Amino acid sequence: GAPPIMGSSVYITVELAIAVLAILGNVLVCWAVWLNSNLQNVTNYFVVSLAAADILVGVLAIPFAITISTGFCAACHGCLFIACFVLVLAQSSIFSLLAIAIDRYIAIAIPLRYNGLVTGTRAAGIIAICWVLSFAIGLTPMLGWNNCGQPKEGKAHSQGCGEGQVACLFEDVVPMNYMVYFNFFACVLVPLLLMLGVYLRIFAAARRQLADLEDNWETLNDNLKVIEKADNAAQVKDALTKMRAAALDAQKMKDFRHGFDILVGQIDDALKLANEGKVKEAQAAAEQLKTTRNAYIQKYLERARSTLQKEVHAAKSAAIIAGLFALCWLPLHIINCFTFFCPDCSHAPLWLMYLAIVLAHTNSVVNPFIYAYRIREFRQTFRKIIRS
Ligand SMILES: CC(C)CCC[C@@H](C)[C@H]1CC[C@H]2[C@@H]3CC=C4C[C@@H](O)CC[C@]4(C)[C@H]3CC[C@]12C
Ligand SMILES: CC(C)CCC[C@@H](C)[C@H]1CC[C@H]2[C@@H]3CC=C4C[C@@H](O)CC[C@]4(C)[C@H]3CC[C@]12C
Ligand SMILES: CC(C)CCC[C@@H](C)[C@H]1CC[C@H]2[C@@H]3CC=C4C[C@@H](O)CC[C@]4(C)[C@H]3CC[C@]12C
Ligand SMILES: CC(C)CCC[C@@H](C)[C@H]1CC[C@H]2[C@@H]3CC=C4C[C@@H](O)CC[C@]4(C)[C@H]3CC[C@]12C
Ligand SMILES: CCCCCCCC/C=C\CCCCCCCC(=O)OC[C@H](O)CO
Ligand SMILES: Nc1nc(NCCc2ccc(O)cc2)nc2nc(-c3ccco3)nn12
Ligand SMILES: CCCCCCCC/C=C\CCCCCCCC(=O)O
Ligand SMILES: CCCCCCCC/C=C\CCCCCCCC(=O)O
Ligand code: NA
């Protein structure tokens, strides 16, 4: 039985290193959004709420975790607050991650009404609501779902604790049925699975829209070929009507509008000739469409594709951060499931408990790196802040 202060020293030093890095990186995130107007959008207000939670992991949750690792004598409800505050921050993180996913889904699925639906003032209200709900969820044990009514009196007496005090240890005061059914299953796992469903819908919507762009491009070029090798006016008419409906479908900005105005007008010109039975004249009119396709329509196609690809890239970055949250927190939740559901299993050893706690805390370090490596506007602003 090695002196407890030795393993404690390693755990505490690692926790302090994580707290430093969590504070520095996420202060840098908030500083960048504040300074750069190109970063001030609704998506990034949730990014700032998430960075604020991670700053508070460094400032408060990690000092609280160090404190509760000592088992110090405490009034049981004060111990509960120390134990549970990190659950507030994790819950707030989950709400921010879900909001970010939903924001990106609205932007990809209904871009025409995004800016009118998703506003900064509405985002700020949602963030406030989510922080209140996070306190209610994370501090639910302080409303009575706790083990303070059944203190471990033998452990309290062995530590010389006073009357009304307990040895402040997480699993002695926080009920494991709360931790597994309420905190994990209901408040963490279900939202993460909802996030997964939202991300699946985003990527499926992106895949469909790109396919629709390429299908309209092919339909344009196919029907031009049909007109060239048509042998009567009715065949020219058939292909032009399908081109005209497709042109309006791709129209659904001034040089954009001009290009489609020429295109639809040139289709109408050829359609009128077709309906007069002037096939050769209609086919010559339709050849003009190629100049418009080359000078205008292909540029719109390429720009639309480029916008969708950037949205896919941004949704992947957001999904990575949600996935890293799950990766860092799941081990601790899974261990709680073993403790709770398998009372015939030996408890996970202490070194593994503390490795899983450290891992969870490390999640508060990682997001600034994901933004730096994946989002140029963040990376460039970080550069300017550091250099200056
Ligand atoms: C706004 C921020 C900076 C203020 C931080 C206040 C924190 C540190 C305060 C608020 C309530 C406090 C707890 C309230 C009650 C108890 C029970 C006592 O037997 C031991 C200390 C303990 C566990 C306190 C520790 C410190 C504590 C968590
Ligand atoms: C900005 C918002 C979140 C305000 C934060 C204030 C919170 C952190 C403070 C304000 C008053 C504090 C409480 C005051 C008194 C007690 C009684 C004690 O037996 C257990 C701790 C407990 C319950 C404290 C926990 C922390 C507490 C709730
Ligand atoms: C989220 C991804 C990374 C998966 C993480 C799985 C981890 C948390 C799993 C894999 C193997 C698991 C261990 C397998 C067996 C035992 C022995 C038992 O007496 C206590 C729990 C304990 C020690 C488990 C704790 C949780 C555990 C370490
Ligand atoms: C998508 C995934 C990661 C969601 C989380 C899966 C969780 C809930 C699963 C993964 C492994 C599962 C555990 C595997 C083995 C045991 C030992 C058994 O004696 C009691 C149940 C228990 C403890 C399971 C509880 C639930 C569990 C922890
Ligand atoms: C916004 C920035 C402001 C900074 C935020 C504050 C930093 C919190 C530091 C430590 C919290 C842990 C403190 C809990 C210590 C309790 C130890 C104790 O009370 O020991 C006596 C007990 O009776 C056993 O005998
Ligand atoms: N089970 C658990 N334990 C602890 N700390 C106590 C580690 C421990 C466990 C058993 C023991 O005899 C002595 C120490 N922190 C913990 N934090 C969490 C947690 C936060 C979010 C999800 O799980 N679970 N959790
Ligand atoms: C920028 C402000 C950040 C706050 C700094 C806090 C750093 C202190 C860290 C941990 C405090 C641990 C207190 C130990 C509990 C008492 C042990 C015992 O009584 O047995
Ligand atoms: C811990 C369980 C949580 C309790 C759930 C019930 C309490 C919160 C309910 C609804 C919050 C909805 C926010 C409505 C604010 C007003 C909006 C507006 O004025 O436009
Ligand atoms: Na977080």
From Swiss-Prot:
UniProt GO BP: adenylate cyclase-activating G protein-coupled receptor signaling pathway; adenylate cyclase-modulating G protein-coupled receptor signaling pathway; apoptotic process; apoptotic signaling pathway; astrocyte activation; blood circulation; blood coagulation; cell-cell signaling
Description of post-translational modifications: Ubiquitinated. Deubiquitinated by USP4; leading to stabilization and expression at the cell surface.
Keyword Ubl conjugation attached: yes
Topology Extracellular: residue spans: 4-9, 69-79, 146-175, 342-349
Binding site for adenosine: E171, N336, A360, H361
Superkingdom of the source species: Eukaryota
GO molecular function, one term: calmodulin binding
A GO cellular component annotation in the UniProt record: glutamatergic synapse
List of glycosylated residues: A156
Assigned keywords, A-Z: Cell membrane, Disulfide bond, G-protein coupled receptor, Glycoprotein, Membrane, Receptor, Transducer, Transmembrane, Transmembrane helix, Ubl conjugation
Disulfide bridge map: C73-C161, C76-C148, C79-C168, C342-C345
Membrane disposition: Multi-pass membrane protein
Compartments, as annotated in UniProt: Cell membrane
Cytoplasmic side: 35-44, 103-122, 201-317
Subunit comment: Interacts (via cytoplasmic C-terminal domain) with USP4; the interaction is direct. May interact with DRD4. Interacts with NECAB2. Interacts (via cytoplasmic C-terminal domain) with GAS2L2; interaction enhances receptor-mediated adenylyl cyclase activity.
Function: Receptor for adenosine. The activity of this receptor is mediated by G proteins which activate adenylyl cyclase.
Family: Belongs to the G-protein coupled receptor 1 family.
Domain notes: The cytoplasmic C-terminal domain is necessary for targeting the non-ubiquitinated form of this protein to the cell surface.
Name of this chain's protein: Adenosine receptor A2a
The organism of origin for this protein: Homo sapiens
Region of the whole protein represented: 2 to 305 of 412
